[PDB]
From Swiss-Prot, chain B:
Modified residues (Phosphoserine): 16
Compartments, record wording: Virion
The protein's role, per its UniProt record: Forms the conical core that encapsulates the genomic RNA-nucleocapsid complex in the virion. Most core are conical, with only 7% tubular. The core is constituted by capsid protein hexamer subunits. The core is disassembled soon after virion entry. Host restriction factors such as TRIM5-alpha or TRIMCyp bind retroviral capsids and cause premature capsid disassembly, leading to blocks in reverse transcription. Capsid restriction by TRIM5 is one of the factors which restricts HIV-1 to the human species. Host PIN1 apparently facilitates the virion uncoating.
Protein name, as recorded: Capsid protein p24
Region of interest: Interaction with human PPIA/CYPA and NUP153: 57-87
Annotated organism of origin: Human immunodeficiency virus type 1 group M subtype B (isolate NY5) (HIV-1)
PTM comment text: Phosphorylated possibly by host MAPK1; this phosphorylation is necessary for Pin1-mediated virion uncoating.
Subunit composition and interactions: Homodimer; the homodimer further multimerizes as homohexamers or homopentamers. Interacts with human PPIA/CYPA; This interaction stabilizes the capsid. Interacts with human NUP153. Interacts with host PDZD8; this interaction stabilizes the capsid. Interacts with monkey TRIM5; this interaction destabilizes the capsid.
C-alpha cells in the first residue's frame, strides 16, 4: 500500500495525512450514523491493523460507542482464537506464525508481521479481518444514532 | 491503483467496489461544495490517471461543472508541455490526463526511479478545477 523507498522499491506506507483528514471530516459529520460505515470501509481500504488503530483513536468524543467497539473487538479476538485452532508454534523454525486475535487487533504484532501476513501467498488478510470486527461493532453502535 | 503481484511486479488493481461506492456517495451529497475536495483527495489516493478518469466520469449530473473541469485540465496539460520541454519517454500533458497514455505507461512513470508522479500531478489539476467549480455551488 504504496510509496517508493530509497532502493527504488514500492513498499507499504502507513495511513496518509490525506486519508486521515477525510476520516476526521467523516467522523465530525457522520459518527456514528449508518452513513459512517461505507465511508469507513472505503477509507480503510488496504489498511493494516496499525492503520486501523490510528483510525479508531482519532475519533473525538463518542466515548460510549468507542467502549462498545472495544468490547466487540475483545469478543471477536477471543472467538477467532477458539475457531482457529493452532499448533503451539510453526513446525518449521523460520516459518511465519499464524496470527492470533491479539495479532489481528494489532496489540501483539509488529507492522512488519502485519505486512507479512497481508502479502503472504495466499494472503492472511489481517487488515480485512480486523475491519470486519470493527464493522460488526459499528453496526451495533449505529443503533445509538 | 497499483499493487505488486506474486511475481513482484507492479500492476493495476481496479478501483474497488467500496471506493467507487464511497465516491458516488460523496458526489451525491457534496458535489461541488468545498467539502468534496478532501474526500476526493483521500478517495483518489494512489489513483493512476486512468482511475482518476473513472472517478470523474462517475459524476452524474453537474454537466456544466464537468465541462469547466475538462477545460481546466486541458489548459494545465498544454501548460505542462510548455514548462517541460522534451526532445522511457517523458509524459506529456495529455499523457498525465490519461488521454494519450496507456495504463502500463502510467504505472511505469509512477513506479520509475525516481517516480514521475503522473497521478499526483493530474490530481493537482483536477483539484485546481474543483476549486473553480466550487464557486458555482
Ligand atoms: Cl488485509
Ligand atoms: Cl502518482
Amino acid at each position: 500500500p504504496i510509496v517508493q523507498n530509497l532502493q527504488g522499491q514500492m513498499v507499504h506506507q502507513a495511513i496518509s495525512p490525506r486519508t486521515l483528514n477525510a476520516w476526521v471530516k467523516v467522523v465530525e459529520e457522520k459518527a456514528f450514523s449508518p452513513e459512517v460505515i461505507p465511508m469507513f470501509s472505503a477509507l480503510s481500504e488496504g489498511a493494516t491493523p496499525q492503520d486501523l488503530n490510528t483510525m479508531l483513536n482519532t475519533v473525538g468524543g463518542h466515548q460510549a460507542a468507542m467502549q462498545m467497539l472495544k468490547e466487540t473487538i475483545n469478543e471477536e479476538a477471543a472467538e477467532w482464537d477458539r475457531l482457529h485452532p493452532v499448533h503451539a508454534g510453526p513446525i518449521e523454525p523460520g516459518q511465519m506464525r499464524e496470527p492470533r486475535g491479539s495479532d489481528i487487533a494489532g496489540t501483539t504484532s509488529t507492522l512488519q508481521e502485519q505486512i507479512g501476513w497481508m502479502t503472504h501467498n495466499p494472503p492472511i488478510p489481517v487488515g480485512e479481518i480486523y475491519k470486519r470486527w470493527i464493522i460488526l461493532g459499528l453496526n451495533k453502535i449505529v443503533r445509538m444514532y
